[PDB]
Write a protein that binds this DNA or RNA. Structure first.
Ligand SMILES: [Mg+2]
Ligand SMILES: [Mg+2]
Ligand SMILES: [Mg+2]
Ligand SMILES: [Mg+2]
Ligand SMILES: [Mg+2]
Length: 749
RNA sequence: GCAAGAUCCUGGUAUGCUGGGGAGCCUGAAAAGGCUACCUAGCAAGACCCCUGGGGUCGCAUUCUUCACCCCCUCGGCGAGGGGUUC
DNA sequence: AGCTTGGTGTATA
DNA sequence: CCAGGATCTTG
DNA sequence: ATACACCAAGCT
């Protein structure tokens, strides 16, 4: 089903986006824009706060797990050494908070003549020193730690500061003696400072070093008269540390292929999108005859010869030598902007965008389709013409700075031939923009991997059986068997929970017995409850909130001419507690038990409609799905959304999240984020230079449309559009995610 | 070419949270509650393998999960990794 | 009652 | 937060 | 330090 045409490929690579064009050619002039799509990616970023990528967060978590594993193994080996020496380690409970510190202070101060008491104090001191040993260089050997100046100069400065503050001198002033003395003298004192966060002045200021703990242990050994091999073994067990190695980063030569990852996140996202587009374009129109790529001027902050440019040249030249691409040329930013400038093509005129800035011309970054338009413009480019345009800009910027207290055109026959050949490019762009064939899409994240819950462990609340129970207290029951038993109490014919959060579900009953499969709970027995009336799971003996939702399952019930819709918001914790995070599981259609937080905190109408059997699952929505409202647009606008839709009549909206049980958060697909953020900045510091549409767009972002699901899915002709790699909506029901209509979708199974 | 770095990766540290404790202080004194520290265990759910338990290794990346089709790579029908699937 | 929307808490250095 | 190993960039 | 999920006044 491949019809070979003559077409060229245009790729603009940005920090958060990539624009791609397949332009069919007839006589070395543009003939047909086959596909133009801009793909918005996160560049591998999973933490928007710190800018850390998903791979970096995963590596930090994995190394934290490995640190805990090695710490557990090292402390177990120390415990076996202390058992071999007969020294008793510090017990888990039923000891004073300062037994370890007082043991360290007493062994570093005086000699202990009692045998069992000395061994007990030595075991307490050595176990506590292994739990708190301070930092050393990981490449420094134990022998090199022993060759360090003991004590360290930072601890000498700290000890002099402590002697100045408290007017006392301890010989020898180890951290064990000073901490024990300060915990006896000024109780409640903090020992180490916190950079995270009334005037509890800390005892120490610098980070503890392993040489100081080693010096204190050797001072304790010299005072107590321990044998040399015993001291050597105790040092080698307390300060044991794995040396750093290189397991994973194990780095004419053959150029890498398209399917091979490059290791860097932004380049990997751009490579994956370009690889999918190139594969689909090859299967539908044959191979391209050249590939023109525009790396951005950015994409490195905190002809291009950057790492992204080198990786893209090597992989696209691998594809070229495997498929027959005649040349591959990669340019440096921002050549395509001036190439768009000389043909009189503006995004604000091409897509009929209203003006946002009162003074000066608005930046093209407002409409996200500018990437695909730049890819179309890039398709026409050649390296000689790009050189002439770069020389023209370099000549123009100096005359522009000179003429402030120009514009002069450099002459080129290749530029003249290019401008003659690209006369109809503007007409093609108008024609393709009129029928809305230029698409802005985002890649879907469908794998159920990530943080399963929030990190903060929370304390359990607790409720008696025999008291009065409200709806929130029913919803917060931790144990699923007790939850199902209270479910059978409040509704014996029901399988799900349909109560208001504030209503009084059931009164006090002094002889209520909750029967189970393994015990019987009396009316005086106390049920473990989640602390708050929100989605939570039981992890490691505590409660944690659920993370962000993986998806929302769409349910429909009622008549054909007027149905009702609701979302079942499913997080990774629901799939974790349902046992669905395993092999061979379709996580969008698998049945969730009633005790999951999804079905606990679903809307009451959805619960009652599923219990009545009327409501069936007709589809699913992930963050990043595109809602095409059709040519009608949004007919249920109210509030600031109406004033937004007067000047930006958007029909394509992107799902970002599901903020409660009845609402879905939608942003406009074609409108950018950072442009509206700098509009907010100019609203903050430059009054009256912003138009009314700019003011409304600045107020609309960042939270966009917090939209009622009943007000969204009540539109006939609304489609959940899932694109192919070329930016075309997938309408054939296959094994890839397809476009569907909420008003007409078949029920699952 | 000093090196400002960018991407990770490896080894550590100190807080923080939860469970169990408690040195000082404040209440309650019948009894147990809080604050500041400090001690101790754990810090994704879990999964696999080896000798009841234990110990080791993976588990937040590769944005269309699973399934289906096609292509590529390593080892010995056979799994593990990747990649693509046009509207 | 129900939709707008304003504010805020998240593991961190 | 720390030190330092590997690519690869820019100086 | 983000952005999303949750909470809790206001309009209608
Ligand atoms: Mg673990
Ligand atoms: Mg400890
Ligand atoms: Mg330590
Ligand atoms: Mg671009
Ligand atoms: Mg401790």
């Amino acid at each position: 089903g491949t019809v070979p045409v003559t077409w060229r490929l245009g790729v603009d690579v940005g920090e958060r986006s990539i624009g791609l064009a397949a332009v069919s050619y007839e006589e070395d002039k543009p003939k047909e824009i086959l596909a133009a799509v801009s793909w918005i990616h996160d560049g591998g970023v999973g933490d928007e706060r710190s800018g850390a990528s998903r791979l970096a967060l995963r590596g930090m978590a994995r190394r934290a797990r490995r640190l805990r594993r090695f710490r557990r193994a090292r402390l177990r080996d120390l415990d076996m050494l202390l058992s071999e020496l007969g020294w008793t380690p510090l017990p888990d409970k039923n000891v004073s908070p300062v037994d370890a510190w007082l043991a360290r202070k007493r062994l570093a101060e005086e000699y202990v003549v009692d045998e069992t008491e000395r061994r007990r104090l030595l075991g307490y001191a050595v176990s506590h020193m292994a739990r708190h040993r301070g930092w050393r260089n990981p490449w420094t050997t134990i022998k090199d730690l022993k060759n360090l100046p003991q004590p360290s100069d930072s601890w000498e400065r700290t000890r002099e500061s402590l002697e100045a503050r408290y007017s006392v001198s301890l010989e020898p002033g180890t951290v064990g003696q000073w901490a024990g003395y300060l915990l006896q003298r000024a109780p409640g004192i903090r020992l180490n400072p916190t950079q995270q966060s009334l005037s509890n002045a800390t005892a120490f200021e610098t980070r503890l070093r392993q040489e100081d703990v080693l010096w204190e242990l050797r001072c304790i050994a010299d005072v107590q008269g321990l044998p040399e091999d015993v001291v050597s073994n105790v040092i080698d067990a307390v300060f044991c540390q794995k040396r750093p190695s290189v397991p994973a980063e194990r780095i004419r030569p053959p150029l890498p292929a398209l399917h091979e990852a490059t290791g860097h996140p932004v380049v990997d996202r751009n490579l994956a999108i370009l690889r999918k587009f190139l594969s689909s374009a090859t299967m539908r129109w044959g191979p391209p005859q050249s590939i023109v790529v525009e790396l951005a001027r950015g994409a490195s902050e905190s002809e291009s010869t950057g790492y992204a440019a080198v990786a893209l040249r090597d992989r696209l030249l691998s594809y070229g030598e495997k498929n027959g691409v005649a040349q591959v040329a990669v340019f440096r930013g921002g050549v395509t902007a001036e190439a768009r400038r000389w043909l009189d093509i503006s995004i604000e005129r091409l897509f009929s965008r209203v003006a946002i800035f009162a003074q000066s011309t608005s930046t093209k970054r407002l409409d996200r389709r500018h990437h695909a338009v730049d890819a179309v413009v890039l398709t026409t480019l050649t390296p000689g013409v790009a050189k002439t345009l770069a020389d023209a800009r370099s000549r123009r910027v100096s005359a522009e700075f000179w003429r402030r207290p120009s514009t002069e055109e450099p002459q080129s026959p290749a530029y003249r031939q290019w401008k003659e050949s690209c006369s109809g490019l503007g007409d093609l762009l108008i024609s393709t923009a009129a029928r809305d064939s230029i698409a802005v899409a985002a890649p879907l994240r469908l794998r159920p991997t990530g943080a399963l819950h929030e990190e903060t462990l929370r304390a359990f609340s607790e409720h008696t059986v025999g008291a009065a129970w409200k709806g929130a207290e029913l919803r917060r029951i931790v144990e699923p068997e007790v939850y199902a038993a209270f479910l059978a109490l409040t509704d014996p014919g029901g399988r799900f929970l349909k109560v208001s959060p504030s209503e009084d579900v059931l009164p006090a009953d002094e002889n209520r017995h909750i029967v189970l499969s393994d015990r019987v709970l009396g009316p005086r027995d106390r049920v473990k409850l989640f602390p708050d009336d929100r989605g939570s799971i039981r992890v490691r003996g505590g409660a944690a909130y659920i993370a962000s939702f993986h998806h929302a399952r769409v349910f429909r019930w009622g008549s054909s001419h007027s149905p009702s819709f609701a979302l079942l918001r499913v997080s990774l914790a629901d799939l974790a507690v349902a046992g669905l995070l395993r092999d061979g599981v379709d996580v969008f259609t698998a049945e969730l038990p009633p005790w999951t937080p999804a079905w606990r905190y679903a809307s009451i109408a959805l619960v009652k409609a599923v219990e009545s059997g009327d409501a069936k699952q007709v589809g699913w929505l992930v963050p990043g799905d595109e809602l095409d409202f059709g040519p009608e647009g949004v007919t249920t606008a109210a509030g600031d959304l109406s004033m937004f839709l007067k000047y930006f009549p958007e029909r394509h909206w992107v799902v970002t999240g599901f903020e409660d049980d009845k609402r879905i958060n939608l942003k406009p697909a074609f409108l950018s984020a950072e442009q509206a953020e700098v509009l907010r900045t100019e609203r903050s510091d430059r009054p009256d230079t912003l138009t009314e549409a700019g003011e409304i767009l600045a107020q609309f972002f960042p939270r966009c449309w917090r939209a009622t699901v009943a007000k969204v899915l009540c539109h006939p002709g609304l489609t959940v559009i899932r694109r192919t790699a070329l930016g075309q909506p997938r309408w054939r029901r296959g094994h890839l995610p397809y476009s569907w209509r909420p008003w007409s979708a078949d029920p699952w199974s």
